[PDB]
C-alpha cells in the first residue's frame, strides 16, 4: 500500500497521500470550521477560517488545500490556531449587516454558529459598514448582497456543477461583488443549490421568504416522485402544514442536489 | 465608478463595434503567440487593441471577444471590471494621470494637482465639456526617482513645475505633442549635479572572461 | 574584506544604464554583450547553475531567495510538458524606478538572461510580463527582440547552439497585485490578478499547468555577466550571503534623486551623502528612511547611521532590503499622512482573494485616516497593532504582510507623535 | 568617438499606438510552432 502516517494532536492516523489536512481531521473525527470548502466544489482557500498550526513550523496552513505528508503533527486545538480563528472572524464580522433578525438564515446560519463557538464574544470595529447594490437574478432566488462574505461557492457552482458560467466576481479589493454585471437571470434546472449551498443569508429562497424559522420545522425525509431519479428529500413541515423541501444526502443519486422542481 | 452596468442607450449590446482588417491580423498574430488548448490567455491584449481601436470599452468589445475567443462573455466582464487601465466610461481625447503616491506626494505632486485643476476648471474625475482632457488620480507609475509626474496616454511627463505643466496642457490644447521625458536638466534618471558613476567609458567585448569558457 | 562602498566603473554590470550609449544591438556589442553565447549554452544547464550557484546571487525581487537552488528546482526531465521561464517586469513598488530603466536602456542584457536562463533549466521559451504603463519600455525592448531575431541570436538555432528558445513580450493592465509570481501567472493566463495557493509550487504547476520559474529583471540580466566574468568575480563584493552589486533608487527628500549601482554593504549614510547628493537640509534634517520601498517598514534617524544597504544587516534591523528602494523623508514630512497615503496604497491594489487582506486593510485605512485627523484615543494603538499582527501571516500572497509592515513600523517607532496629535485633537475640540 | 552626453534613447519620441502590436506581428512569421494540449478549449 501506500498509506502514510500523521499525527492529530498526537493521535496517529493513517491517510492516503494527497491528502489534506481537513480531510485528515475528518477521519480522526474533528471538524475544521470552513467557509469557502466544499466537499463537491472545487478548492478555493480564500476564507482562511480554517488555519490551523503544524507543529514546529512558525506559519499556519491553509487545512482546506494543503496536504499533508510523512511525521506531520496537527495542533488543532492550539493557541495560536484559536487566535487565527478569531482574528479571520473578526474580519469576516467588520463589515457584516446587522440583519439577523431580518434574515432567514437566522438560527441555521454557519456564520452565527461558528462564530458562537469560535469567534470572540465583542466588536473592535468602529467604521461605517459597506453596501452592496442587490441584484436581481430570477423569481426563485432572492439574492441580498450586503451579507455575501465573497466565498465564491456561486462561481464554483454555476462553472462546475450547473455548468452555466454566468456568475462572476466584478471589481477589486473591498469594492469586490459577486454577481452577473448585466440584468441576467441564472435560470438552470439546478438554481436552487446555491440557496442550499450559500453559508450566509445573500441567496434565500423567494417562495420561501419570510415564512418560517429553523427551529420550529418538524423534517421528515421522504421521497421526490415528480421525476423518475428518485431523490432522497427532507420535508420541513410547521403544525401540520408543509413549509420547504430540502435535499438528503444519498451519494449514489442525488448527492446533495435537487432539480428546483422538486423544491 | 460602479461594477454594475445599466443598459443605456449609449452603452446597450445592440451598440455596433467591429474590429478593423488589420486589428483583426493583429489578434491573429496574439492568438498564434500563445499555446493551443489555452486560447483564453489572450483577453487581455485583444481587449486592450479593442480599446486602443474606440477610445473605452462599451458592452459590445466585451461580447465581441468572447466570441471571437470563445470564452464565457463573465470571464470578459471580470477581466474589464479587475484592471484599472480597462475605460468601460467614455474618456476624453487626453487622460492626464496624475500619481500621488509617498515618493511623489513628498516632491509636492499636490500643487501639480490643484494647478491642473485650477488651469482647466474641473476637478478629480471630470471631463472637459469639449470632452479633451479627463484627470484623473492614479498610485505610483515607477518614475519615483523622476518625481513628480503625470502621464497623458501613453507619454510619461516627468520632474514637472506648475508653469511647465501648464505650458504642456496649452501644448495639447494647440493640438502639438510634447516631448515625453524629464523636464528639468537632467536626460533620464541621473543626478543633476552631473555623473556620480559611469563617467568611464565601457571596456567593450572580452574583458575579464573567466579562463575555460 | 570589512568596508565597502565605492564600487568602480570597471565592476559595473549595467554599463549604459544612465541612457547616454545607444542601447540597439551595435551599442551592446559595443559594450559586451552577446558574447560567446554558443559556448555559454553549450558548457551545460549545471555548469551555468554550478556558476549561479557559487556567485551567491540572491533575489533581486525583494524576497532574496538564492538564485541558484530556485533555478535548480526545474533541472528535473519532462514528463511531457513544457517548461516557461517568465521574466516579470511589472514593478508597481513604490520608490522603484530600477528595471524600468533596464528595459528601456539594455534590453539586450535582459535577453541574453533571458537566452541563458532558459539553458539553464531547459525552459522552451520565455513570457516577458511587462507593466501596462510602460508603453514605450516595452515597444523599446520589442525593437530589441527583433533585431536579435533578425541576427539569428535567439530563435531557431539559437546563436548556432542548436537550442530551442523563443522570447515573448505580454502587457499588462494597470494591477499592482499582478506582481506577485502565481498572480502574473493567472494573468498571463487570461484570469484575474489573483495569487494562487503554494503548494503548488511554479516550478510543479505553473503557466498553463506548465513547469514555470518567475525570475526579476534585476536577476536575470546579470546572468550573462555571471558566467562570462565568472562566479567568484560576482561573490567577491559584499559580506557573506549578500554577494554582488545592486541598483539602488534614492528618491523622496533629496537634493538629487537617481539610480545608481552599488556594492551591496554600503552603508546609508555613505550612499546618501555620495551619490544623492546629500539629504534636502543636511544630514541633521533626517527624520525617517523606507529602505526597500513600500512594502519594507520605515527606520528613523538615530537608527539609519550606522546600517549597512544589505539582507542581513537590515533583517538584524527588523527591515528589510526589498527593492533596494531608499525613500527619505526630511523633518518636514507629516510621517503620519505619509503612511496613511502608503495604506490607501495598499487598499487600492489589493485583489479581494483571500479575507484577510480585504477587510482589514480597508479597516487600517480608516483608522489611519482618522489617527492622521487625530479623532482617536491612545487604545486604537495597541488596537491597531493587534489587527496588523492578525493579518501578518494569514494571508494567501504576501501583499498582506506588506500593508501590515509599514503600519507596524510606524507604530513602534513613532507612538509619541501619534499620541501627542491625538491628544491635541482632542484638546482643540472638547 | 565617446560621448557622455547626447541621450541616445530617442526613438521612442516616434511611437504611435500601434506600435507594440505592428512589432509583435512582424515578429510572429519568425517563432516556432506552439505545442497542444490535445484539445482546442479546456470546455472542448
Ligand atoms: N520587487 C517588488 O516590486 C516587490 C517586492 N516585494 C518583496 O517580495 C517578497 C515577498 O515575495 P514572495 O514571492 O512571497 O517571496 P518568497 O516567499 O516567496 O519566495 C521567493 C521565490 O522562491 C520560491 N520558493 C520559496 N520557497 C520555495 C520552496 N520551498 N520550494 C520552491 N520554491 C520556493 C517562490 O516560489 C518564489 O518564486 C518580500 O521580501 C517583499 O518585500 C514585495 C512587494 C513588491
Ligand atoms: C504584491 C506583490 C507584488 C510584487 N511585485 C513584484 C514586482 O513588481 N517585481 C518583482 O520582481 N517582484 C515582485 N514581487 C515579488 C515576487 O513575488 C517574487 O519574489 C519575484 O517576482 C521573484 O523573485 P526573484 O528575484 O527571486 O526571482 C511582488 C510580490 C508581491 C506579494
Ligand atoms: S447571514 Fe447570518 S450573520 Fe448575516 S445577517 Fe443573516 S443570520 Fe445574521
Ligand atoms: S452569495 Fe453566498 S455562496 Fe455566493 S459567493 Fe456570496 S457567500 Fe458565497
Ligand atoms: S493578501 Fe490581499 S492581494 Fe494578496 S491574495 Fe489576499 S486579498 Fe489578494
Ligand atoms: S476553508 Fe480553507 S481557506 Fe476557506
Ligand atoms: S510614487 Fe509616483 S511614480 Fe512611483
Ligand atoms: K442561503
Not at chain 3, 15 to 43: C, F, M, P, V
Not at chain 3, 253 to 260: A, K
Amino acid at each position: 500500500s501506500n498509506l502514510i502516517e500523521v499525527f492529530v494532536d498526537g493521535q496517529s492516523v493513517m491517510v492516503e497521500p494527497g491528502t489534506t489536512v481537513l480531510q485528515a481531521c475528518e477521519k480522526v473525527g474533528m471538524q475544521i470550521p470552513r467557509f469557502c470548502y466544499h466537499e463537491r466544489l472545487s478548492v478555493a482557500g480564500n476564507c482562511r477560517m480554517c488555519l490551523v498550526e503544524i507543529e514546529k513550523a512558525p506559519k499556519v496552513v491553509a487545512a482546506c488545500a494543503m496536504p499533508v505528508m510523512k511525521g506531520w503533527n496537527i495542533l488543532t486545538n492550539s493557541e495560536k490556531t484559536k487566535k487565527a480563528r478569531e482574528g479571520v472572524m473578526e474580519f469576516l464580522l467588520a463589515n457584516h449587516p446587522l440583519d439577523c433578525p431580518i434574515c432567514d438564515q437566522g438560527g441555521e446560519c454557519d456564520l452565527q454558529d461558528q462564530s458562537m463557538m469560535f469567534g470572540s464574544d465583542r466588536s473592535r470595529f468602529l467604521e461605517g459598514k459597506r453596501a452592496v447594490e442587490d441584484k436581481n437574478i430570477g423569481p426563485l432566488v432572492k439574492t441580498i448582497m450586503t451579507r455575501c462574505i465573497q466565498c465564491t461557492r456561486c462561481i464554483r457552482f454555476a462553472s462546475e456543477i450547473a455548468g452555466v458560467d454566468d456568475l462572476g466576481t466584478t471589481g477589486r479589493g473591498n469594492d469586490m461583488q459577486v454577481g452577473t454585471y448585466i440584468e441576467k437571470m441564472f435560470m438552470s434546472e439546478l438554481s436552487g443549490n446555491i440557496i442550499d449551498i450559500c453559508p450566509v443569508g445573500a441567496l434565500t429562497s423567494k417562495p420561501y421568504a419570510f415564512t418560517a424559522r429553523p427551529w420550529e420545522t418538524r423534517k421528515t425525509e421522504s421521497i421526490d416522485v415528480m421525476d423518475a431519479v428518485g431523490s432522497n428529500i427532507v420535508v420541513s413541515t410547521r403544525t401540520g402544514e408543509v413549509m420547504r423541501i430540502l435535499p438528503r444526502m444519498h451519494e449514489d443519486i442525488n448527492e446533495e442536489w435537487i432539480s428546483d422542481k422538486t423544491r | 465608478a460602479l461594477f454594475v452596468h445599466r443598459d443605456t442607450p449609449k452603452n446597450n449590446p445592440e451598440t455596433p463595434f467591429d474590429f478593423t482588417p488589420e486589428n483583426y491580423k493583429r489578434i491573429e498574430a496574439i492568438v498564434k503567440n500563445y499555446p493551443e488548448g489555452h486560447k483564453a490567455a489572450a483577453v487581455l491584449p485583444v481587449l486592450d487593441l479593442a480599446q486602443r481601436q474606440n477610445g473605452w470599452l462599451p458592452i459590445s468589445a466585451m461580447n465581441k471577444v468572447a466570441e471571437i475567443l470563445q470564452v464565457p462573455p463573465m470571464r470578459v466582464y471580470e477581466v474589464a471590471t479587475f484592471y484599472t487601465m480597462y475605460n468601460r466610461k467614455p474618456v476624453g481625447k487626453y487622460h492626464i494621470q496624475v500619481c500621488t503616491t509617498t515618493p511623489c506626494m513628498l516632491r509636492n505632486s499636490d500643487s501639480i494637482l490643484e494647478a491642473i485643476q485650477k488651469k482647466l476648471g474641473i476637478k478629480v474625475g471630470e471631463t472637459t465639456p469639449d470632452k479633451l482632457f479627463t484627470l484623473i488620480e492614479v498610485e505610483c507609475l515607477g518614475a519615483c526617482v523622476n518625481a513628480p509626474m503625470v502621464q497623458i496616454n501613453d507619454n510619461y511627463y516627468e520632474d514637472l513645475t506648475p508653469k511647465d505643466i501648464e505650458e504642456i496642457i496649452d501644448e495639447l490644447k494647440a493640438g502639438k505633442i510634447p516631448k515625453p521625458g524629464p523636464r528639468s536638466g537632467r536626460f533620464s534618471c541621473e543626478p543633476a549635479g552631473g555623473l556620480t558613476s559611469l563617467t568611464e567609458p565601457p571596456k567593450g567585448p572580452g574583458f575579464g572572461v573567466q579562463a575555460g569558457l | 574584506k570589512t568596508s565597502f562602498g565605492s564600487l568602480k566603473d570597471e565592476d559595473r554590470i549595467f554599463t549604459n544604464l544612465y541612457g547616454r550609449h545607444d542601447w540597439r544591438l551595435k551599442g551592446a556589442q559595443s559594450r559586451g554583450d552577446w558574447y560567446k553565447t554558443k559556448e555559454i549554452l553549450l558548457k551545460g544547464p549545471d555548469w551555468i547553475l554550478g556558476e549561479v550557484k557559487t556567485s551567491g546571487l540572491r533575489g533581486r525581487g525583494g524576497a532574496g531567495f538564492p538564485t541558484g537552488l530556485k533555478w535548480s528546482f526545474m533541472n528535473k526531465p519532462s514528463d511531457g510538458r513544457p517548461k516557461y521561464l517568465v521574466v516579470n517586469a511589472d514593478e508597481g513598488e513604490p520608490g522603484t524606478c530600477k528595471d524600468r530603466e533596464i528595459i528601456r536602456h539594455d534590453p539586450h542584457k535582459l535577453v541574453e538572461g533571458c537566452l541563458v536562463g532558459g539553458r539553464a533549466m531547459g525552459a522552451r521559451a520565455a513570457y516577458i510580463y511587462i507593466r501596462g504603463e510602460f508603453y514605450n519600455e516595452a515597444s523599446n525592448l520589442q525593437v530589441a527582440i527583433r533585431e536579435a531575431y533578425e541576427a539569428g541570436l535567439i530563435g531557431k538555432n539559437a546563436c548556432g547552439s542548436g537550442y530551442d528558445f523563443d522570447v515573448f513580450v505580454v502587457r499588462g493592465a494597470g494591477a499592482y497585485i499582478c506582481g506577485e509570481e502565481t498572480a502574473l501567472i493567472e494573468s498571463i493566463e487570461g484570469k484575474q490578478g489573483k495569487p494562487r495557493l503554494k503548494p503548488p509550487f511554479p516550478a510543479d504547476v505553473g503557466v498553463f499547468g506548465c513547469p514555470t520559474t518567475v525570475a526579476n529583471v534585476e536577476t536575470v540580466a546579470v546572468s550573462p555577466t555571471i558566467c562570462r566574468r565568472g562566479g567568484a568575480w560576482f561573490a567577491s563584493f559584499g559580506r557573506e550571503r549578500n554577494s554582488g552589486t545592486k541598483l539602488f533608487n534614492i528618491s523622496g527628500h533629496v537634493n538629487n534623486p537617481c539610480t545608481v549601482e552599488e556594492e551591496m554593504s554600503v552603508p546609508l549614510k555613505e550612499l546618501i551623502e555620495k551619490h544623492a547628493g546629500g539629504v534636502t537640509g543636511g544630514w541633521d534634517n533626517l527624520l525617517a528612511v523606507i529602505p526597500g520601498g513600500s512594502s519594507t517598514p520605515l527606520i528613523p534617524k538615530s537608527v539609519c547611521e550606522t546600517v549597512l544597504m544589505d539582507f542581513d544587516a537590515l533583517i538584524q534591523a527588523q527591515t528589510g532590503l526589498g527593492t533596494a528602494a531608499v525613500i527619505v523623508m526630511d523633518r518636514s514630512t507629516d510621517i503620519v499622512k505619509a503612511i496613511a497615503r502608503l495604506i490607501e496604497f495598499y487598499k487600492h491594489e489589493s485583489c479581494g482573494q483571500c479575507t484577510p487582506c480585504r477587510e482589514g486593510v480597508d479597516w487600517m485605512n480608516k483608522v489611519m485616516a482618522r489617527f492622521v485627523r487625530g479623532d482617536a484615543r491612545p487604545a486604537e494603538i495597541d488596537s491597531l497593532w493587534e489587527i496588523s499582527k492578525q493579518i501578518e501571516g494569514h494571508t494567501i500572497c504576501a501583499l498582506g504582510d506588506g500593508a501590515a509592515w509599514p503600519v507596524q513600523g510606524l507604530i513602534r517607532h513613532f507612538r509619541p507623535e501619534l499620541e501627542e496629535r491625538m491628544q491635541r485633537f482632542a484638546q482643540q475640540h472638547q | 568617438p565617446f560621448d557622455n552626453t547626447t541621450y541616445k534613447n530617442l526613438q521612442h519620441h516616434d511611437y504611435s499606438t500601434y506600435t507594440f502590436l505592428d512589432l509583435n506581428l512582424d515578429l510572429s512569421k519568425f517563432r516556432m510552432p506552439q505545442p497542444s494540449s490535445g484539445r482546442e478549449s479546456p470546455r472542448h
